[PDB]
C-alpha cells in the first residue's frame, strides 16, 4: 500500500510551528517524484539526498514533520540556521539528510483582520537541539526572581501569535512546511520507492 503522504500534505489543519506535528511513515511504498513533479511548491530543497533518486531508495523510517511559519522564516528550515524559528521552534541537524517542502497558504491560514490561531515560541533560554519540541506554556523567567504564573516585568508569556493578515506582502504571509527526514538504521527498512 501507498504511504499516507496525502494525510500529511493535504491535511485540513496544520500545527503551530512550536508544537510542530510528526507523522511517522512505516511499511509502505512512496512515489517521491509525484511530489517533486508538482509546481504547487514554492520551496523544495533537499539536503543529503537527490529528489529524483528517491524512488530508487529504501529507508527504515521516514518522518513527515509539518507546521506553519512566515515566508521570511522559511530560510531557517535549513541545516545551519538561526532566528526565532530555528532556535526556539524547530531546528534541523547540521548533518541533515532530507527534504524541506513549503508552499504559500495565504488562502487557507489568514483570516481578514488576523488569524490568532498559529503561534510561535518567542522566548526561550537556550537553543533547541535538532528535532526537539518544546510545548511548555510556563511563564518565561527573564529575571532572577521567579515568576509564579503571572505576566509581569521580567515574566513573559512565551508563545505569541503571527497576526496573519491576507493583505500583507508575501514575506509576512503563512507558508505551510513539510520536512521529510529519511533515516537508515540497522533494522528491516520498510519505506521503499517503487
Amino acid at each position: 500500500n501507498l504511504c499516507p503522504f496525502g494525510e500529511v500534505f493535504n491535511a485540513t489543519r496544520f500545527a503551530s510551528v512550536y508544537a510542530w506535528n510528526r507523522k511517522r511513515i512505516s511499511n509502505c511504498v512512496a512515489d517521491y517524484s509525484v511530489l517533486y513533479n508538482s509546481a504547487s511548491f514554492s520551496t523544495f530543497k533537499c539536503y543529503g539526498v537527490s529528489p529524483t533518486k528517491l524512488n530508487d531508495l529504501c529507508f527504515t523510517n521516514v518522518y513527515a514533520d509539518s507546521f506553519v511559519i512566515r515566508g521570511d522564516e522559511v530560510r531557517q528550515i535549513a541545516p545551519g540556521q538561526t532566528g526565532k524559528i530555528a532556535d526556539y521552534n524547530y531546528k534541523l541537524p547540521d548533518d541533515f539528510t532530507g527534504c524541506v517542502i513549503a508552499w504559500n497558504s495565504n488562502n487557507l491560514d489568514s483570516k481578514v483582520g488576523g488569524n490568532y490561531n498559529y503561534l510561535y515560541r518567542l522566548f526561550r533560554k537556550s537553543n533547541l537541539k535538532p528535532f526537539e519540541r518544546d510545548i511548555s506554556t510556563e511563564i518565561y523567567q527573564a529575571g532572577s526572581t521567579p515568576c509564579n504564573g503571572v505576566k509581569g516585568f521580567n515574566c513573559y508569556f512565551p508563545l505569541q501569535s503571527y497576526g496573519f493578515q491576507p493583505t500583507n506582502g508575501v514575506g509576512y504571509q503563512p507558508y505551510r512546511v513539510v520536512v521529510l527526514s529519511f533515516e537508515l538504521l540497522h533494522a528491516p527498512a520498510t519505506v521503499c520507492g517503487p
Epitope: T82, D87, Y88, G114, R124, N127, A142, F153, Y156, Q160
Partner: antibody
Framework: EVQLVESGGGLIQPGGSLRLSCAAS????????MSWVRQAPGKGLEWVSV???????DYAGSVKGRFTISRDNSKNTLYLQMNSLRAEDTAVYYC???????????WGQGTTVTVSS | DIQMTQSPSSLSASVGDRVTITCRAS??????LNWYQQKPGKAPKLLIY???SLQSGVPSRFSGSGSGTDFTLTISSLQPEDFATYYC??????????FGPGTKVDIKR
C-alpha cells in the same frame, strides 16, 4: 535595581576600534534579547545588533563584519566590539533589553562615540 | 520589511490639551506596536506596549490605540513635563525593530 550601566566610548580615529560595555543589574542578559541601538546627532533610533538568549546574533547591514556583540554571564554584561570604525558610526550608543511584544523597557544611559581624524 | 511613518512631525499644543500623535506601518503588524518618549540628552522611555497596554509607572493620561496599519498615541491632558519627542517602534520583526521618524511636541505660543 533595574538598570543598564554603559561605558567605553570616546574619541577614536577611523580604522581604530572601541569596546562598549553594558553592565546589567535587575535582569539577566543571558535570559534576554539584548540589543545595541545607536542614534546619530539629531537623527533618531537605528538598531545595530542583537544577542539572543540562546546565543545567536544579528547585525545591521552597515556594521556587519566590523562589530561583534558578546556577553560574559559571570559579570552580567553585554559587550559591543566595534572594529574598523568609520566616521559614520559617530553616534550615541544605547544598550537595551528587548522584551519584544512587551516593548524595549530598559535602556542604558548611553555612551557617546566620536569617530574623527 | 516594514517602514514607519509619523503624521504631525512637529505639533504645537498647550498645557491641558488632548494631543494625538499618529503612526503607520507599510504592512499590517497587528497590535505589535510600542510607543516611546524621548527628551534631549536622555534615553527613550517606553510608554505603550502591545498598542494599548500602559507601561509600569507611566501616567494614566497616556492612552494607546490602533491595530493593523494605523496607530494612535493619545495624551488626555498634556502636562509641562510632557513636551518631548514621541516615536513608535514595531515588534512584528522582533528582534530587528524599526522606529518611526518622530513627532516633536513643542509649546504653543
Amino acid at each position: 535595581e533595574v538598570q543598564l550601566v554603559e561605558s567605553g566610548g570616546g574619541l577614536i580615529q577611523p580604522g581604530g576600534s572601541l569596546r562598549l560595555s553594558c553592565a546589567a543589574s535587575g535582569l539577566i542578559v543571558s535570559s534576554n534579547y539584548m540589543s545595541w541601538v545607536r542614534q546619530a546627532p539629531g537623527k533618531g533610533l537605528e538598531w545595530v545588533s542583537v544577542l539572543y538568549a540562546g546565543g545567536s546574533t544579528d547585525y545591521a547591514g552597515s556594521v556587519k563584519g566590523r562589530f561583534t556583540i558578546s556577553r560574559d554571564n559571570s559579570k552580567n554584561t553585554l559587550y559591543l566590539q566595534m572594529n574598523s570604525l568609520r566616521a559614520e558610526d559617530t553616534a550615541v550608543y544605547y544598550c537595551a533589553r528587548d522584551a519584544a511584544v512587551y516593548g524595549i523597557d530598559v535602556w542604558g544611559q548611553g555612551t557617546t562615540v566620536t569617530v574623527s581624524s | 520589511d516594514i517602514q514607519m511613518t509619523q503624521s504631525p512631525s512637529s505639533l504645537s499644543a498647550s498645557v491641558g490639551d488632548r494631543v494625538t500623535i499618529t503612526c503607520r506601518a507599510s504592512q499590517s503588524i497587528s497590535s505589535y506596536l510600542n510607543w516611546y518618549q524621548q527628551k534631549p540628552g536622555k534615553a527613550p522611555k517606553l510608554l505603550i506596549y502591545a498598542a494599548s497596554s500602559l507601561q509600569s509607572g507611566v501616567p494614566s493620561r497616556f492612552s494607546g490605540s490602533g491595530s493593523g496599519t494605523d496607530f494612535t498615541l493619545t495624551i488626555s491632558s498634556l502636562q509641562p513635563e510632557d513636551f518631548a519627542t514621541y516615536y513608535c517602534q514595531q515588534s512584528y520583526t522582533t528582534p530587528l525593530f524599526t522606529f518611526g521618524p518622530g513627532t516633536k511636541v513643542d509649546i504653543k505660543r
